[PDB]
Design a protein around this ligand. Structure first.
Ligand SMILES: [Ca+2]
Lengths: 145, 125
């Protein structure tokens, strides 16, 4: 089988002490990450959520985001259900973005960009002003429409 | 030129500090850190001393009744009340501010609490 985990990589140029595994950083850099040369890989996930009478609030936790990443989300009702409210907060509850109703008022959308070293996000959808809605979310995916 | 201060905030009642006779061209620096409780620091600088309580209360009045988007309404009110301000520029929720003294005169520094939400079951600023 394959294996999974974290790793530490030390690269040297004309520095024979690297093969000992104890080389401290020195000199001027010579290599860089290759993935930075092309567009960031997108991730998209879709879910169906239902707001019962006693369950009019719904929260979901997201995976950690690296600095410079972007976040997008949108919600569209399955049928005649009214548009709910949407907002984005971190793990402590600090608000970060609020949903905007589109001019063809059938959907709500949200956008955010990452400033901190590690960001943990929470998506809030509430109808506490058998309704069912579709939740579409993406990371580095501006084409969610 | 560095000075330290310590205080206590109760239910969003801020504390004013006076900066007598600054000169044009000076640079002010500010930093505010939480040392106990659930305080979320906020710092602002202004010329004429006026209590922000009446203006900031209307922000809580609007959000409590609707969507209103707090982060929008707070920025608009702050950009009117203060010449310069910062909410979360430091490590965590701590504030940090750089402000170049516009003209010659005296100014006031305002320390207090911002409007935030700290729950995941319901939204309540
Ligand atoms: Ca703050």
């Amino acid at each position: 089988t394959y294996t999974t985990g974290s790793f530490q990589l030390i690269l040297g140029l004309n520095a024979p002490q690297v093969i000992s595994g104890e080389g401290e950083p020195e000199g001027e850099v010579f290599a860089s990450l290759a993935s930075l040369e092309i567009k960031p890989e997108a991730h998209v996930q879709e879910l169906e959520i239902r707001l019962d009478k006693d369950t009019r609030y719904l929260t979901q936790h997201t995976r950690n985001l690296q600095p410079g990443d972007t976040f997008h989300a949108l919600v569209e009702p399955i049928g005649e259900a009214p548009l709910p409210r949407l907002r984005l907060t971190d793990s402590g509850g600090k608000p970060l973005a609020f949903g905007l109703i589109d001019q063809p008022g059938e959907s709500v959308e949200l956008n955010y960009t990452c400033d901190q070293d590690i960001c943990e996000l929470v998506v809030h959808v509430d109808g506490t002003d058998e309704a069912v809605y579709r939740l579409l979310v993406g990371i580095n995916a501006p084409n969610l429409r | 030129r560095v000075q330290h201060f310590t205080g206590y905030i109760e239910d969003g009642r801020g504390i004013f500090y006076s900066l007598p006779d600054m000169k044009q061209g000076d640079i002010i620096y500010a930093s505010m850190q939480n040392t106990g409780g659930n305080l979320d620091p906020l710092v602002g600088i202004m010329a004429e001393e006026i209590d922000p309580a009446v203006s900031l209360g209307q922000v809580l009045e609007k959000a409590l009744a609707s969507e209103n988007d707090l982060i929008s309404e707070l920025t608009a009110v702050a950009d009117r009340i203060f010449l310069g301000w910062d909410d979360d520029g430091g490590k965590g929720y701590s504030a940090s501010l750089e402000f170049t003294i516009p003209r010659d005169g005296t100014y006031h520094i305002f320390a207090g609490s911002t409007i935030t939400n700290q729950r995941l079951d319901k939204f309540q600023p």
